[PDB]
A = this chain, B = another copy of it.
Amino acid sequence: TPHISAPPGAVAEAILLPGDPLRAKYIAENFLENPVLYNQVRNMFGYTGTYKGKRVSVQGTGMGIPSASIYIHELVQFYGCKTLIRVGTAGAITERLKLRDLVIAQAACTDSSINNLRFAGQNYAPIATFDLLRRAYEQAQSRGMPVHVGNVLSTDTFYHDQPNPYQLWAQFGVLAVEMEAAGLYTLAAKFGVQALCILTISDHLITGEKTTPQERQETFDQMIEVALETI
């Protein structure tokens, strides 16, 4: 494959998908037994290790739907991945959410043309695999984590033209903004595999607040634990 150079059995069927290749490294080193790097092309780190005697992989996807789609396609179609859990950060767009809240994306809105191209002006809703969603939720519950299940926005545009770019979305119940989930949910459905996006609130886009570095790591770790128990 042009983007992941690894032999065909190097990647586990269950895989975590941070955007940041360094977070992949971080996850492999801190939560997996015997993590072995399988990819370095474009610095996009991927590792395979074990969790409770089962193989788990972790692969950076980069930012945005076009980048993540590349890795997801290759993982599913070339490496046989079946359970794909994105673990990431998001910006909250409602005051009802607080920093360090966990968001489990039931579905993903988008401003990408990904589905407009294919459904030609009809509306396709990219969704999480229910069983995975339900599990993550109960895992988060058992740990007493503040968790919300609902809509996220997958945007192509981190930096906006004008202010209040997310006002309409929030008025329609969207919880948070990130850049990958709509791509993951769409491709998982196309391929008949199972997917979930879990997110940690790092920035509040309404209150202006941002978490401190240590606060991120603490809740990030919790998120990883949920993700691993969700598999």
Q: Which A residues fall within an 8 A CB radius of B?
A: 19-22, 41-45, 60, 62-67, 69-70, 73, 77, 106-128, 130, 134, 137, 149-151, 155-159, 161, 168-169, 171-174, 179, 182, 186, 189-190, 192
Contacts and interface: CB of A to CB of B under 8 A. Distances in A.
7 contacts: A20-B43, A21-B43, A62-B62, A112-B112, A112-B156, A123-B125, A125-B126
A12 to B, nearest CB: 22
A-B interface, 10 closest residue pairs, ranked by CB to CB distance from nearest: A64-B66, A43-B43, A173-B189, A125-B125, A130-B149, A107-B125, A113-B113, A111-B122, A66-B156, A63-B67
Contacts of A156: 65-66, 69, 112-114
Contacts of A158: 66, 69-70, 73
Contacts of A172: 124, 186, 189-190
